[PDB]
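## Example record

The block below lists the input lines for one assembly entry, exactly as stored, with component labels intact.
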Amino acid sequence: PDKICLGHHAVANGTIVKTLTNEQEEVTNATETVESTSLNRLCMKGRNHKDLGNCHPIGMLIGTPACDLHLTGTWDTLIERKNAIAYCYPGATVNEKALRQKIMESGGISKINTGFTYGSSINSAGTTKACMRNGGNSFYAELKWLVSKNKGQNFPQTTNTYRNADTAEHLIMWGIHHPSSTQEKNDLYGTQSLSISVGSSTYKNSFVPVVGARPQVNGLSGRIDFHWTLVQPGDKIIFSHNGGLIAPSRVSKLIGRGLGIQSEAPIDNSCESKCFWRGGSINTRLPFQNLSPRTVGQCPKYVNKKSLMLATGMRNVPE
Amino acid sequence: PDKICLGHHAVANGTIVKTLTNEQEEVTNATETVESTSLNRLCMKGRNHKDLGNCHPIGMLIGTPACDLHLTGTWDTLIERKNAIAYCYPGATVNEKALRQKIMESGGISKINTGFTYGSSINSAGTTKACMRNGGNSFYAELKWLVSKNKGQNFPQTTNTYRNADTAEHLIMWGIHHPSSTQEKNDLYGTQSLSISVGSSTYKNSFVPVVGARPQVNGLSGRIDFHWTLVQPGDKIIFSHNGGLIAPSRVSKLIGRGLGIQSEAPIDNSCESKCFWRGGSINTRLPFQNLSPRTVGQCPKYVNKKSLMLATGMRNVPE
Amino acid sequence: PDKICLGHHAVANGTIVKTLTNEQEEVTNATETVESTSLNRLCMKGRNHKDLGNCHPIGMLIGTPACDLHLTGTWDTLIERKNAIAYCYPGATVNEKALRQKIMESGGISKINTGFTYGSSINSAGTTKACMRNGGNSFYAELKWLVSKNKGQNFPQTTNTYRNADTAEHLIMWGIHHPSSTQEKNDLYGTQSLSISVGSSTYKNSFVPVVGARPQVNGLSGRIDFHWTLVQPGDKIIFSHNGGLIAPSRVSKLIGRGLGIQSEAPIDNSCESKCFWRGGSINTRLPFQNLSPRTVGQCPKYVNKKSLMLATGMRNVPE
Amino acid sequence: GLFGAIAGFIENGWEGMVDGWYGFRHQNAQGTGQAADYKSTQAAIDQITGKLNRIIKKTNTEFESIESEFSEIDHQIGNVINWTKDSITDIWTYQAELLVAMENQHTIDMADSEMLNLYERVRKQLRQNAEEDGKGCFEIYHACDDSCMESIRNNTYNHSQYREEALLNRLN
Amino acid sequence: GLFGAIAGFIENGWEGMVDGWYGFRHQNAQGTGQAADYKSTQAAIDQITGKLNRIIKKTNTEFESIESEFSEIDHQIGNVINWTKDSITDIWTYQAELLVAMENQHTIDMADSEMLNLYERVRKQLRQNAEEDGKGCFEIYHACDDSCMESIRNNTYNHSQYREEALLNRLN
Amino acid sequence: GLFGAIAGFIENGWEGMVDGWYGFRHQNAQGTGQAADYKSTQAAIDQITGKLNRIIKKTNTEFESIESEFSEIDHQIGNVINWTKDSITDIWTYQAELLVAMENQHTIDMADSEMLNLYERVRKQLRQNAEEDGKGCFEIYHACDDSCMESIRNNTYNHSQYREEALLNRLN
Ligand SMILES: *[C@@H]1O[C@H](CO)[C@@H](O)[C@H](O)[C@H]1NC(C)=O
Ligand SMILES: *[C@@H]1O[C@H](CO)[C@@H](O)[C@H](O)[C@H]1NC(C)=O
Ligand SMILES: *[C@@H]1O[C@H](CO)[C@@H](O)[C@H](O)[C@H]1NC(C)=O
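Predicted structure tokens for the full assembly:
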């Protein structure tokens, strides 16, 4: 008799996939669902970005020398690097983590003058070997180390007031100097009892410089601790002090939103991406990735798996 | 020959659903799995509830004028509103978020007298235009502004002790007055060095009133900061003070548990609901909802989907 | 005609399982996927373990008498028990939860001497009834209660420095004594105003002994509050004080990593396990468990289910 | 589809059949008729009802607020809450999408299998007395009145009665 | 069910078959007998073993404590932990229920398919020498002794050996 | 497999069928033929494409950093973040494994079903003019030339045109 036979294709080299019932099932074709490869670069095509280099985000607000080119700007992406510099004079910022994350969430910084002026008893141009600029002693660009003009004399009872005339909230910072020795405390501010008060409608606090022995950081046992708050539109903030205030010459306004990235990978303007990690960019259409659980942006979900092959064909039954 | 034909039903207007293999599959009937509609109403049937109105939860413990109808009570559901008034006199509570949550987790408040009494040189009836009650100057109902009887004189060294005679822990609150100016400080508490210490078996702290310039909130630049702790059963708490303490006339006892709700929707006693959010109530039988990720009670899960139609019929193949 | 019949097996009594379409589906056999039983022991075979007994982890650092057998050691597994003792003299540790967690993540403790010495007018051997050791008055083994040798005499201004000469970070603790009265404070430290300051390259703080009336705990109204920080390799930490410092005689080094268990179950050195909870060990091969959502180690996932039966056979259709 | 009947060898559905999901249309000397099959219809409805009872349901877990509607959250903890809630929402969105897609696939194919099971049942009853036309119909090679047609639908058709007549007509 | 054999056209199972999952009962002049089929039995068992190997396991992720058993946890962070843990528990409870429900549906339908595949293999083997009774049996229109019955079970039955005899008995 | 054709009664696939997934081989007096079937091939491809469209995809959710790469995270919240991230990772790893295992099972079985649906479509076309050999072929009991073979592949074969010749040859 004549005959007609029904059949299906096969391939010489099939691919192994896993099913509900079988770990080693051969199919005609399959495709990977877990991304294993990363580009070792930050893909910045179509992104107005700022690479901070050795500038730490907090340094952008206080004006550390390393941040002189990053005091203002707009960006959709802000890139922070390892071992970035925030403090030239030894010290720290209170609530540092919350502040850094606010900066890394922003889409830019604008600076507005406080307009603080000082009487003739105040020398507002104090500088230090710790904060070098062009081979000369200098200071945080956005603040002023206020000291007594005459060495040893009492720093006068001063009031400085900043009013937010803008429609948006402004971030203000200041420092408190904690001298290394009593003789240094007396030289800059006098023998009087020192006290700094700061008050607004939504914030208030008081500070006292403390003299105390500490080890030297960058050659100095002294410390400048930074503090901060948000001044709401229309509100004012009042600084009352008589020695030890590191006063702001400017305040910051954070604008919009941007993606903060922490990474050691070099910029590539010819590559475009939505997902980033410490080691670079994840440019894939695949739903999963095994590169790192620490990613930012619009990303594939991290999974603890080398490979997960999705079948794109029938069982392979070769001849 | 004769014929018998087998077939299936169909409908005129089928419904589109998504399958594993097909984005636009027509079936005879389907049903929604994601709830889109909300009832713009707080459904309170079967619940002993308390609508706070313009009273803020913290105002219940200190006794703000707006909270006079909510100083004690029992409930299984507590409803907080937008722009609720906690503080008539300007200030803030230390560890405020935790305190508000404890109140919104509770199922009632009871009040117990501290029995605090004061010598004749103390005026314990200090009032202010900020805290108005019955058209006249008043104060927080559960507290007393202690000032010197004679203007300018030193407020006397005073000790007050509350014993928790109960079997359950009690929540004690007190305020610290931070004067606007040195003139105000001296008029109320005298020229002496002010100090306030608080001590129980499980709590220890000290406080100093702080004079400093601040902007005016509802006309006033001074501040009353509130602090709180839990006094364990059988324990005592000792206040030692010489000016600046805003002392409790009663302590609070939080009773049982209840559901805290933050919303702007009006109450409705004609319907029962187990799920609430800012906009109102969710009375659905469906497993998912797309109204808000912020919900409280026994709720369907939030999903980023407009609609997910579940097929309740075969493929529709019309004539 | 002859005949051959095709059929399948069945059993007298089948097992009920749930499917997508049927809650009461009878099958020939099934197996459990949710583990309901625990071993009521801590299975410690193949683990270098330390059972702390009545010694609280923080007590290992300060040297509470209950922790005298646990001042140093090594372990991969550390077992904490209910109602373990940290403080013999009444008080508390600032940032205690983070500290307890660090100890419970560690794989051992080493102790290094601070080398602090004190002049002839200081008594550095202060003991208390509250901290008994060898049937006699004692103190925290790793600290020293410093007081004036002659009662009433001002405690001399003192500065001590610990240098970390190691290549890994050390953990240093100290206490501040808060006397019950002015008379006590004057007897121990003199009438001078008291101040303690602590400074390294990475840490700065100051402390003031608070005199205030308080109820007795273990028959004592005084309090000793503990503070801690990490001293980085090569760094100095400097203590400046004139009364009130409870000074470290040793610092701690936390060594490696280990698994911290909080449990009520007794040790069994004859069984192995990877999963632990309050009630003991879970040695199941099953994917889920209903014992507790609080487990540590490599564990099955917690589910709110008594049982979930997985079919291991066909539909049972009995005769 | 998986079982090849619905949107397969059966060309289309019947809009006229409003009293059941599956059924019979016949032609004999007395005329034509339509009758739904209860057992197949019920088997499909019961399985779909089973799905609805399992799916149209929420958990009994009581959740309370961790995000203040009328007040600012702490900065560090607020970012953790936003990350967690978005991660959880991604999980539930995904699971819901997979659930409904998987269930819809099974519902469609389950309905297909019940059509086929009815078709196979009838095929096996008719034995050597009828032949399949390929469109879901059987051409019966003997006279089959309204009682005979009823017996096919009732599942009480006895093939041996009509076998000799059918075989003569089939073999010709 | 999906494939129409188990709890379908086969009326019920055989409790007396204890050496396999699927098999044969025959009737001829010599008498009756019963034998299990190895291949269909092992196919079903192997697939269920595969499911068990995948499902009966835990992750190797090591978790540490974020909640104190014997002491207080901070109010703000504590509420976040309770919300997160309960959210994670709802996910795993839901996933466990769905996994087992889906797998049970597939296990039952897979077993049904293996019964049908055996039935179909026998049908094609017998070709024109037998007819289906509708209950899972084949009426064989020739003398089929123990060796013949064994050849049907062994998949070595040659239809053309008996075709002439069977067509005589089937069609006269 | 689930529908019994692929890796079933069809012994193996054809490596020489490069123009489609399913098809026909034939033998008649004129020659040996082979041709892909477009409808079944495209039905399988479209269904696999639909799965790929659903699976090869991300969420639109934009996540920001809650762990500092270069500085220390807070001790308590750091532990909560690690616990939460590892918990989320375990869920996605589980969901990914399940998804792909489930989808792979369905893909293989769907492909099997399209093969069977083609076989069945041809079985019903040929009616009483052919017999199944059990290996996926139909022995045709009349002369079926290239045009006749095309008509089978085109679904325009008319059985009654060849029935007389076929029945005489089948019954000998
Ligand atoms: C295998 O599948 C992938 C994804 O669908 C496809 O791009 C590729 O071309 C396929 N391979 C073959 C040989 O068809
Ligand atoms: C279920 O199967 C297991 C493994 O084959 C076996 O130990 C058990 O006895 C079976 N259950 C019953 C009730 O036969
Ligand atoms: C089959 O279809 C093709 C394409 O339409 C056509 O060329 C051919 O003539 C058809 N053959 C028959 C026998 O109908």
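Chain E has four helices and four strands. Residues F 147, 150-151, 154, 156 surround 2-acetamido-2-deoxy-beta-D-glucopyranose (ligand 3) (CB under 6 Å).
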